Design a protein around this motif. Sequence first.
Motif, mmCIF file in Angstrom:
data_model
loop_
_atom_site.group_PDB
_atom_site.id
_atom_site.type_symbol
_atom_site.label_atom_id
_atom_site.label_comp_id
_atom_site.label_asym_id
_atom_site.label_seq_id
_atom_site.Cartn_x
_atom_site.Cartn_y
_atom_site.Cartn_z
ATOM 1 N N UNK A 50 0.824 -1.202 0.000
ATOM 2 C CA UNK A 50 0.000 0.000 0.000
ATOM 3 C C UNK A 50 0.862 1.258 0.000
ATOM 4 N N UNK A 51 0.463 2.241 -0.801
ATOM 5 C CA UNK A 51 1.200 3.497 -0.894
ATOM 6 C C UNK A 51 0.248 4.688 -0.872
ATOM 7 N N UNK A 52 0.328 5.483 0.191
ATOM 8 C CA UNK A 52 -0.528 6.655 0.333
ATOM 9 C C UNK A 52 0.245 7.936 0.032
ATOM 10 N N UNK A 53 -0.379 8.833 -0.747
ATOM 11 C CA UNK A 53 0.230 10.113 -1.123
ATOM 12 C C UNK A 53 0.342 11.070 0.058
ATOM 13 N N UNK A 61 -5.552 9.265 -4.506
ATOM 14 C CA UNK A 61 -5.793 7.876 -4.879
ATOM 15 C C UNK A 61 -4.680 6.972 -4.360
ATOM 16 N N UNK A 62 -5.058 5.968 -3.575
ATOM 17 C CA UNK A 62 -4.092 5.031 -3.015
ATOM 18 C C UNK A 62 -3.664 3.998 -4.052
ATOM 19 N N UNK A 63 -2.469 3.445 -3.870
ATOM 20 C CA UNK A 63 -1.943 2.440 -4.786
ATOM 21 C C UNK A 63 -1.766 1.099 -4.080
ATOM 22 N N UNK A 64 -2.261 0.036 -4.705
ATOM 23 C CA UNK A 64 -2.155 -1.301 -4.137
ATOM 24 C C UNK A 64 -1.543 -2.276 -5.138
ATOM 25 N N UNK A 65 -0.413 -2.870 -4.763
ATOM 26 C CA UNK A 65 0.273 -3.823 -5.626
ATOM 27 C C UNK A 65 0.450 -5.166 -4.928
#
Length: 94
Positions: A50-53, A61-65
């Motif tokens: 998870x990556x929060x700005x 918009x959060x990123x999920x990989x």
Amino acid sequence: GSSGSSGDIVARLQTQASATVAIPKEHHRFVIGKNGEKLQDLELKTATKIQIPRPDDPSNQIKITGTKEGIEKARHEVLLISAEQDKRSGPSSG
């Protein structure tokens, strides 16, 4: 009948994907946690990245990989929480 019909199309799982979730910077906190435990549990339970700005970045918009299943778990949780807020009623006590 509202959702379902997921289905499964023959496809290998020897790769990695990444999705995102458009949410308000006001909900980003509800995903990180009071002090910073929520996000932790999620990253683990889902085993995703998870990556929060930043709180100053125009990106909300959060990123999920991770694995198709992993990202889904995080995307389903991050959304469920952010959604509840939208259907708020009063001053969230506690």
